[PDB]
Amino acid sequence: TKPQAKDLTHLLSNESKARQTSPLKGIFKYYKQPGITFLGGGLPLSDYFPFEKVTADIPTPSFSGGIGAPIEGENKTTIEVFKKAADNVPDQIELARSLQYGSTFGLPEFLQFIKEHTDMVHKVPYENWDVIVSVGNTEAWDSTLRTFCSKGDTILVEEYTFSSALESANGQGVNTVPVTMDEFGIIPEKLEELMSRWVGNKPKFLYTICTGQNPTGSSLSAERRKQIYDIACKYDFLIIEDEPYYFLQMETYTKDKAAREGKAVHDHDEFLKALVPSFISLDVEGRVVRLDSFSKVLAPGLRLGWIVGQKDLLERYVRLHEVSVQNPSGFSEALANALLRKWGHSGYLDWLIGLRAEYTHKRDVAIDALDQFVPKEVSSFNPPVAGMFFTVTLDASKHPKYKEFLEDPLKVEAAVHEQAIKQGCLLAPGSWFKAEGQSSPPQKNKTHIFFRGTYAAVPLDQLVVGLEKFGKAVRAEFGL
Amino acid sequence: KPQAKDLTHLLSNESKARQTSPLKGIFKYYKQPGITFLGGGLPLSDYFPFEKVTADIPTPSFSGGIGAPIEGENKTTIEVFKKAADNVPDQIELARSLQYGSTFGLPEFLQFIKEHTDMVHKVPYENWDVIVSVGNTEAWDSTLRTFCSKGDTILVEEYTFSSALESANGQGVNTVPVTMDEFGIIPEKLEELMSRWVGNKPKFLYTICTGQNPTGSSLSAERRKQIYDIACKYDFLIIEDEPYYFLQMETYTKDKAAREGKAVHDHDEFLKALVPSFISLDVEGRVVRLDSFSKVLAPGLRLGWIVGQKDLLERYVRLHEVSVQNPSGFSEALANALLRKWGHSGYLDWLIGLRAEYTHKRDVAIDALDQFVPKEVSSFNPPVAGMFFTVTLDASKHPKYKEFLEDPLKVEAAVHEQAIKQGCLLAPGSWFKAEGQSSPPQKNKTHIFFRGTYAAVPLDQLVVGLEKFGKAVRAEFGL
């Protein structure tokens, strides 16, 4: 048995602490009892639900054909969720129950699978941890800001990060103070330094996309995670790890093409050992909240994820969920439960190992094309170890119009972006992801630009075409 | 038809400041031939592990009743394949329904639901639209976030839905109660409250106007007209939270033999019988309607929609993009398939079946209140819509009224405890009371009630429960 998490209820917003259960909780205990005719509720009867069953056709472990193989023949199984429990295989969420209102924590069969998944991978190192359902990391992030932040509070964000996360914070009047990165992500020394001289109320938390970081394609090393966790403990702020790309971890990139087949993980044990430690895995104090999603693993349209953290903080999310999103789609949760239990933990691991193999190959093709096509006199690139994104860094100070552009790297970025489009390829300008913010009160007191690309969006031949056109655009702009 | 009023001045400063993604600057290139688009984050439909989803649904015109077993001639299989080429027309193929998409909603679903909205409500200004929600719970949270800043005031029914007040409380939005009688908001007292209003006007009125939770009241056409006039006069919005709209029923009669003759049979009779919505009256575009499938299909869809003027709906979409993102593509693709397989004609058949089922449940409940509750100390308004009935009691006739210091809440508590002892549980009316004051505040009762539902238990158990409730009132009042 592990220690208890620290009491962090002092990091909740005043508004989150004041949230209450329904005044009709005070009759729920009679909802079970026979002898009592319960007329005090509002539940419709499952008798009219016009869904006798739902089915899906899904692929079959171990996905020996690759996870993208046609779903047919031996690679097709039909899962069925009937309305009535008696008509179902074991451990299903029958539609009479999954299509009824229920507990906002989530349906028990789904929570059990996703909790086992979480513990097998992350070995959460305090006793009083839990999982609750979300309708994806988008909602879970909105709900995080509502649970831990009042208007005028500060959070720390990666100095280049996800535009939607900043928009969500902006909408709630929460200041996003940027944390300095290098090509490998957050620099722990500058985060420590920032905190050591912090003026005014401390930030409530750090928001990190620590695996396959959007837009940098960086992943924090186990060593940087340890140091950042120590800073969160020393200055007493939470870490919110928004981790939709956790299972897009890949084999380390090598230029030696011949070495690549040999590098693949060979079984479930090698796979689990290869995964970078999560902040939850490090979280002896219970100050980590993890946002997990099926979006990049199964499909975005599930609108289903979960949140990992200490019981007493997750309870405040459940109160908010009751009067905001209520619960995920019963169809998504019943079908996800059916797929995961049909595959089993073994099959889901096979799926995640297939996902690793496919992304590893996409990344090798992307970075081989960067190495080949992009002029090195004015460019650099960090091969990603995780995620769907790659970046190309350019020394804007080498652009032959840099003086004529008033030494403004963003005018070089705009020129390269326009030239790329003229050459027939589009990447996302890095400056579009820049986070800006000041604490209240504010704290006291660059020639390189980059572009974000994805290797997950298009067929791999069109990827190579694209990046050749991007190399040309950089050669045209820099006169090479 | 005319343009709606410009009501952008009623948006919260926070809502007005919301922006689109900086990555809209490149979406136009996303389709274009000749551009290799690497600027996005869309994972690949090739890997979505769902080749097909199907559902077994009942078959119009639901002649055996909407709860008839879904088997034989009363079983249709709808199928949504991953690939468009594999589907019947007008489906949302899983390659698209399980992909990120417009937060407005998937086009085939929006088209059906907009057709339905106009067919029933005949929206009387040009620039109206519909957007998707994940139910009226979310749409209400989003309404507060779109039209209210902390310390703003909204008007609510004196007795209303606990989750709606909890949502407003979490946002620091004051809920000022509007006086009701057994038929709902009393317009004359709302006009008076507004005529005397000091300080910033309330942003809107929140009304569960059909099958009101918990009163079981439904505003008459006449009251809706009077309330609409007040909303236009003082320039506030009306938010009609209307999950129970299609639980409208035939008017109650004691005369069992009269019931079948006055029941709607036909589509034309059905559309004529429905109470006008506030959107049907909304010549100015100051109404937002929260619509849901929860009480019509099933709560677990987590799918509804919002009706209102385009420029206000665009602000809900900005919010939705960074809050719920979109409904489940399974929910949206399956609802689109069911609704299009039934068609508008089958959907009306379904809503006419729902009307008949609820009409009968209400008839059984009200016949049992009439039979078993002592008339000496009680009254009841038979609902014309919704899932709730109420029993009103004169607490001042309780033999312990003096012993209770003339506190009706002590009579309520005693009747509640006695009901539980006799084996029947209803919800005390006082639990639904709304309290609030504006900033600054506006300048400066013997009846109690209980909420029951006739929609939760089999009708034989309902009559069991109400006879026990009758015994409980008889014991407490000494009759």
Ligand SMILES: Cc1ncc(COP(=O)(O)O)c(CN[C@@H](Cc2ccccc2)C(=O)O)c1O
């Ligand atoms: C950092 C980060 N957090 C969350 C998500 C989305 O998670 P979900 O809600 O699906 O569980 C992402 C994914 N980024 C996508 C999302 C998107 C939004 C609108 C249109 C297309 C795609 C992106 O924009 O790159 C994420 O990066």
Ligand SMILES: Cc1ncc(COP(=O)(O)O)c(CN[C@@H](Cc2ccccc2)C(=O)O)c1O
């Ligand atoms: C006035 C009102 N508005 C919304 C809803 C729910 O709409 P949805 O989000 O399903 O579209 C209701 C219905 N109320 C239920 C909700 C519930 C909460 C907790 C546990 C069970 C059910 C009720 O309790 O009565 C509504 O009345």
Ligand SMILES: [Cl-]
């Ligand atoms: Cl890295």
Ligand SMILES: [Cl-]
């Ligand atoms: Cl930059």
Ligand SMILES: [Cl-]
């Ligand atoms: Cl009424």
Ligand SMILES: [Cl-]
């Ligand atoms: Cl009362």
